[PDB]
Each structure stands twice: as C-alpha cells, then as structure tokens.
Ligand binder design. Structure first.
Ligand code: ZN
Ligand code: ZN
Length: 93
C-alpha cells in the first residue's frame, strides 16, 4: 500500500514532463533546458523517443503528427521537409 510522496502536501511531481511513450522522466537537453520533443501539441517524448520516431519511425508526432525539426541529439533524416505537391485529401485527421 502506497500513496505517492512522503508527508502531507505533495512535492513538485506528476507535472507531465515525464515521457508518455515509454514513461521515463524527460531529462534535460544537452544544454540544460527542458527537452520537449513536441511543443505544438505538447507530446511528452524523451530524447530516445523523439529521434527514433524520425530514425525508424515516420517522422510524425504520434499525438499530433506535425512536422518535426532537427533537435540537438537528432540528426537530419529522410523526410524532414517536403515541397508542395498536388496531393490533397485529408483521409484521416
Ligand atoms: Zn520515452
Ligand atoms: Zn505533437
């Protein structure tokens, strides 16, 4: 049996920064700032979670599926940005 944190009033926690994909707590970037994979929607994805999505993934946020961007520890991939095309018709979302 447990509750969460010691003492009465809870301590800074369960904010959300904690990645959702795997769970691990989204640490800090190579510089120090908070590592926020996706900001547009706000999908909590650690470092080893964002890169992949672009490495082997599809390069589209699994929450909003928006255009990505070369991060600190994320080398460019084949599908970062494309040019306007005659492909219209939003099948899903
Ligand atoms: Zn993760
Ligand atoms: Zn997103």
């Amino acid at each position: 049996g447990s509750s969460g944190s010691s003492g009465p009033k809870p301590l800074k926690n369960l904010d959300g920064q904690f990645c959702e994909i795997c769970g691990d707590q989204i640490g800090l970037t190579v510089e120090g700032d908070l590592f926020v994979a996706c900001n547009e929607c706000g999908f909590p994805a650690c470092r080893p979670c964002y890169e992949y999505e672009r490495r082997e993934g599809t390069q589209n946020c699994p929450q909003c599926k928006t255009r990505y961007k070369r991060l600190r520890g994320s080398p460019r991939v084949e599908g970062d940005e494309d040019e306007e095309d005659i492909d219209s018709g939003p099948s899903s979302g």
